[PDB]
Design a protein around this nucleic acid. Structure first.
Ligand SMILES: [Mg+2]
Ligand SMILES: [Mg+2]
Ligand SMILES: [Mg+2]
Ligand SMILES: [Mg+2]
Ligand SMILES: [Mg+2]
Ligand SMILES: [Mg+2]
Ligand SMILES: [Mg+2]
Ligand SMILES: [Mg+2]
Ligand SMILES: [Mg+2]
Ligand SMILES: [Mg+2]
Ligand SMILES: [Mg+2]
Ligand SMILES: [Mg+2]
Ligand SMILES: [Mg+2]
Ligand SMILES: [Mg+2]
Ligand SMILES: [Mg+2]
Ligand SMILES: [Mg+2]
Ligand SMILES: [Mg+2]
Ligand SMILES: [Mg+2]
Ligand SMILES: [Mg+2]
Ligand SMILES: [Mg+2]
Ligand SMILES: [Zn+2]
Ligand SMILES: [Zn+2]
Lengths: 91, 103, 212, 101, 25, 136, 80, 97
RNA sequence: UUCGUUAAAGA
RNA sequence: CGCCGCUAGAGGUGAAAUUCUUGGACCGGCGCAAGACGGACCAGAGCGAAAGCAUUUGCCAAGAAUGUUUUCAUUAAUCAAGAACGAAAGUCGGAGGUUCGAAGACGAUCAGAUACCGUCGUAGUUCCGACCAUAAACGAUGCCGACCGGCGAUGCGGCGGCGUUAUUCCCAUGACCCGCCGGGCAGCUUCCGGGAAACCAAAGUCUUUGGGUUCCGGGGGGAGUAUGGUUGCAAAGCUGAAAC
């Protein structure tokens, strides 16, 4: 049964600190509490460790990710540029 | 290359319903030791120790090796079952020619 | 004051075997103070047209030169690029044709790397009634591949002497015209620009080898 | 070292002087842009996270990539409690009283 | 007078009346 | 002094830039390198009227002054480059150049070939006028 | 007043496949005679796939949109 | 009523045409609607071509042509006399010689 | 380059 | 912006001034940095459901059309509710900020400008994530199916033609020419018929009125307003009457 229609996970905060601030904290709390697909063991056990650190459940292979998601879009752009400069004309 | 990938998926679809196959590392080990397996299929992101061990067993037993450019989730999708799989061995292809085309 | 009473005159010596080694005369401020007279002369360039370098060839296909150094009141220049005139470039662009572009970077035999272009226009065949004369764009992609392909295996195996001796009769454009007719009858394929962007070293011994 | 990498190489934790083990661009989610190499007079321009273009030597080192933990200032602190715990973790930089008051 | 600016002035009057309702419900 | 060349018969060249705008006219004699400016007289340097500094009369006066300074400094022939405000404005040349070419050819100054090196943009960067643009 | 019941054969050939009366197809079956040893192969005119002879293992019909082009000029017949 | 069947421009297949700036008033007009002509002028007026040819260096070997894509809008082109008005049976005509 | 207004009716 | 050269003015307008300059403005030559932009080629041409889409190359999936002696076998057309996109402007975060530029400040013309003209410039215009769902979103013209004139062209496939032109020479496509087929954007004429006419091969097959289906109008204002319901951060969007 759907109980909250707008606040979602932010209903633990209740009536305080503004609709816009709660709306902007909603997406990133979903991002920090969502389980991500592990790229190594193929499971969905990426549990959030401390900030910047992501930790898969099985196979214990700790990865250094973003502060709120698993891959920052800027970080993916940096990785694409680094591999492009890698295979660009052999350094 | 997409013709080759769709060919590999179609051959796996044929082996799924017509051929005889085993699933998983501990079940492919018995086949690669008994020599019943002819072709083995590795995932992209299987761990490198298990990958090197299966490659070493296959080049001892004269068994074709095929790497699968894809996560084990879509390798399980390609073999048509809802779980995931990292290692396959086609011990008897029914109507396919994976053991004929690639080696 | 009268600074032109103080200003000095040099004359420009072109590199070898165009036809001659004369371009013109330039003004030098003086060798007064800390600023030596050979300082700005190394940076001075030239944009010279033809009918004075190629022994009565076409008036377009201009050449870009740069003064390498000066040696005994004779400022010596060297190749830096090559352009075409504005009236020729804006001319032969008909409203009912297909304009095909090409551009490619290539390294020479020595440490020079040049970026050379290519322009192509379609041709109404003799006794043609249809006024459009377009292409199916796959011939356009194929001829972009072909014109990018030809210039690489000319200029990759040949340094500045051979590529300027190939740009003297436009052997590259005639070779594209030769290898072009099986795809489409394209009309007046030129290069339209080739400019330098990398330079290895001064190398006055290589400059003397450029002379002879 | 920055003399090996080409231009546009996005690095972090680079050195001011060669051999002081990482000084510039060390906070979370920051990087530097390597441009304008020089064969003679061994220098290299780097665009810092502040936007300053610093000329450094060509022998100092830098780990290739960006610092993990990016986006840390995306979430509002949203209450005084998390700010108190953050500053209790860092240092007593928080007797922030208004100078007019 | 244009129908455009007639609609826009009735729109501004609508905004003023909505603010008046929110001021004194 | 006499200049660079004694016993004439060989032309000493100069690049003459003509920047013909709809409010002023620039005639600018330079050497072949492009750095050493020989002479430069505008329309406002010859006509007091700011409304008439773009006139062909102003072009004739400025070009006669430039040709006199070039004959004093001792250069014979001129290659001519022509341009206007071509960045985003009208690419057509102004009214001054059509008479400035005449006033260079009249008082000496043997002309070589003339090229229209006008700054042509590639792909029409943002125009000053606006949506509906200039209105009277 | 056009004779629709008895039209001209040239007009019925120049009309479209299905627009005309009998709606006969414009395809046929041709008898490719490969010069290898003996084999004559019946093949559809608008052959969508490659055609491999069982004796010489060569491609007789290249796949082409429209109708299939051939190899070096083997003969054919019309069986209608 | 309909004054034109073409509604001014030539957009009949597509639905959006790029606005290209006018020359005089610099108003953005779609390029199938604006008056787009092509002027090939001589770089010297013929009243001074003969003077430059007599006072030139080369012996009549160079004659450059100035090419301009003249691009008016239909609000200033009528004032600039190019696209003057015609009658109801005269709007259907084509290019004059 | 700019130049404002003239109602009700009266065929 | 940094070097080099020359010199008194250089933008700007119908006209001048506000602006920058002997501290070197503007102009030329070289180099650097920034972001926006893809002309000419560009057409009563193409694609896409529309809005829209134009530098090269690679990758990813998608689709019309065509040729189908291919396959399934009525699986179909339109659609209350509901749902996906949806120009530009506008709103919420993040990076920068070239040009233009709402508001704003001035310099002018007029009796009066706070406007049209000029100078500077904020939000925005750019990109990545979210919202809004509006336009002269136009062909002011619902979709599907058939019929009723001709002509000349164009784009895409298919077919035929000891014609011409390119390779080295049969050989296969390339380029042009002639004709046909299908569907597509279009054009000229017509007493085919309609309509009040403009005009329309559809706006025809309608008093000789009926192929199927959806949405909407009932004199002009009030008024797309008030009041309710609902969506939205808000601007506002959807539904939307009465008195007179
Ligand atoms: Mg912030
Ligand atoms: Mg504070
Ligand atoms: Mg306080
Ligand atoms: Mg107190
Ligand atoms: Mg209005
Ligand atoms: Mg109160
Ligand atoms: Mg009217
Ligand atoms: Mg539209
Ligand atoms: Mg009256
Ligand atoms: Mg400059
Ligand atoms: Mg928008
Ligand atoms: Mg705010
Ligand atoms: Mg913003
Ligand atoms: Mg105002
Ligand atoms: Mg303004
Ligand atoms: Mg401005
Ligand atoms: Mg509407
Ligand atoms: Mg509808
Ligand atoms: Mg065709
Ligand atoms: Mg082909
Ligand atoms: Zn894991
Ligand atoms: Zn205009």
């Amino acid at each position: 049964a759907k109980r909250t229609k707008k606040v979602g996970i932010v209903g633990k905060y209740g009536t305080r600190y503004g609709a816009s601030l709660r709306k902007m904290v909603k997406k990133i709390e979903i991002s920090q509490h969502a389980k991500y697909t592990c790229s190594f063991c193929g499971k969905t056990k990426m549990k959030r460790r401390a900030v910047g650190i992501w930790h898969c459940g099985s196979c214990m292979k700790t990865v250094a990710g973003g502060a709120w998601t698993y891959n920052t879009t800027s970080a993916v752009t940096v990785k694409s540029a680094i591999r492009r400069l890698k295979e660009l004309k052999d350094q | 290359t997409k013709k080759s990938l769709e060919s590999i998926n179609s051959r796996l679809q044929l082996v799924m319903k017509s051929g005889k196959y085993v699933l998983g590392y501990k079940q492919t080990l018995k086949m690669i030791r008994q020599g019943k397996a002819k072709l083995v299929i590795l995932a992209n992101n299987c761990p490198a120790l298990r990958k090197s061990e299966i490659e070493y067993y296959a080049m001892l037993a004269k068994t074709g090796v095929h790497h699968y450019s894809g996560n084990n989730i879509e390798l399980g999708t390609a073999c048509g079952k809802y779980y995931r799989v990292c290692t396959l061995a086609i011990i008897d292809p029914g109507d396919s020619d994976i053991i004929r085309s690639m080696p | 004051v009268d600074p032109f009473s103080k200003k000095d005159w040099y004359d420009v010596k072109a590199p070898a075997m165009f036809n001659i080694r004369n371009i013109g005369k330039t003004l030098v401020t003086r060798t007064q103070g800390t600023k030596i007279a050979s300082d700005g002369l190394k940076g001075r360039v030239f944009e010279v047209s033809l009918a004075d370098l190629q022994n009565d060839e076409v008036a377009f296909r201009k050449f870009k030169l740069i003064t390498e150094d000066v040696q005994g009141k004779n400022c010596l220049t060297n190749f830096h690029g090559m352009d075409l005139t504005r009236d020729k470039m804006c001319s032969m662009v008909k409203k009912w044709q297909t304009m095909i572009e090409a551009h490619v970077d290539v390294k020479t035999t020595d440490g020079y790397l040049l970026r050379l272009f290519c322009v192509g226009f379609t041709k109404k065949r003799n006794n043609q009634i249809r006024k459009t004369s377009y292409a199916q764009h796959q011939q356009v992609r194929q001829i972009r591949k072909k014109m990018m392909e030809i210039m690489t295996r000319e200029v990759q195996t040949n340094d500045l002497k051979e590529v300027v001796n190939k740009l003297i009769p436009d052997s590259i454009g005639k070779d594209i015209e030769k290898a072009c007719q099986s795809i489409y009858p394209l009309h007046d394929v030129f290069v339209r620009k080739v400019k330098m962007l990398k330079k290895p070293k001064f190398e006055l011994g290589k400059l003397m080898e450029l002379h002879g | 070292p920055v003399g090996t990498m080409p231009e546009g190489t996005i690095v972090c934790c680079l050195e001011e002087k060669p051999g002081d083990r990482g000084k510039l661009a060390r906070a979370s989610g920051n990087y530097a842009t390597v441009i304008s190499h020089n064969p003679e007079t061994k220098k290299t321009r780097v665009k810092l996270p502040s936007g300053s273009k610093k000329v450094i030597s060509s022998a100092n080192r830098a780990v290739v990539g960006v610092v993990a933990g990016g986006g840390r200032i995306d979430k509002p602190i949203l209450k005084a409690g998390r700010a108190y715990h953050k500053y209790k973790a860092k240092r007593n930089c928080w007797p922030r009283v208004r100078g007019v008051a | 007078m244009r129908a455009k600016w007639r609609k826009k002035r009735m729109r501004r009057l609508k905004r003023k009346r909505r603010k008046m309702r929110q001021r004194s419900k | 002094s006499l200049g660079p060349q004694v016993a004439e018969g060989e032309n000493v060249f100069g690049v003459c830039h003509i920047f013909a705008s709809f409010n002023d006219t620039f005639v600018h004699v330079t050497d072949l390198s492009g750095k050493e400016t020989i002479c430069r007289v505008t329309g406002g340097m010859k006509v007091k009227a700011d409304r008439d500094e773009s006139s062909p009369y102003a072009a004739m006066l400025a070009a006669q002054d430039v040709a006199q300074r070039c004959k004093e400094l001792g250069i014979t022939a001129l290659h001519i480059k022509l341009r206007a405000t071509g960045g985003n404005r009208t690419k057509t040349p102004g009214p001054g150049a059509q008479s400035a070419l005449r006033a260079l050819a009249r008082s000496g100054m043997k002309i070589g070939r003339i090229e229209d090196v006008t700054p042509i943009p590639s792909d029409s960067t943002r125009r000053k006028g606006g949506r509906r643009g200039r209105r009277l | 007043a056009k004779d629709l019941l008895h039209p001209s054969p040239e007009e019925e050939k120049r009309k479209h496949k299905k627009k005309r009366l009998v709606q006969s197809p414009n395809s046929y079956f041709m008898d490719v005679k490969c010069p290898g040893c003996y084999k004559i192969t019946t093949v559809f005119s608008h052959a969508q796939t490659v055609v491999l002879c069982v004796g010489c293992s060569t491609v007789l019909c290249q796949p082409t949109g429209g109708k299939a082009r051939l190899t070096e000029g083997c003969s054919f017949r019309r069986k209608q | 009523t309909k004054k034109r069947r073409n509604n001014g421009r030539a957009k009949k297949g597509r639905g959006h045409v790029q606005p290209i700036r006018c020359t005089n008033c610099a108003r953005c007009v779609p390029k199938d609607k604006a008056i787009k002509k092509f002027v090939i002028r001589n770089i010297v007026e013929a009243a001074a071509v003969r003077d430059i040819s007599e006072a030139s260096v080369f012996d009549a070997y160079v004659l450059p042509k100035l090419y301009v894509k003249l691009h008016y809008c239909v609000s200033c082109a009528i004032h600039s006399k190019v696209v003057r008005n015609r009658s109801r049976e005269a709007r259907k005509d084509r290019t004059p010689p």
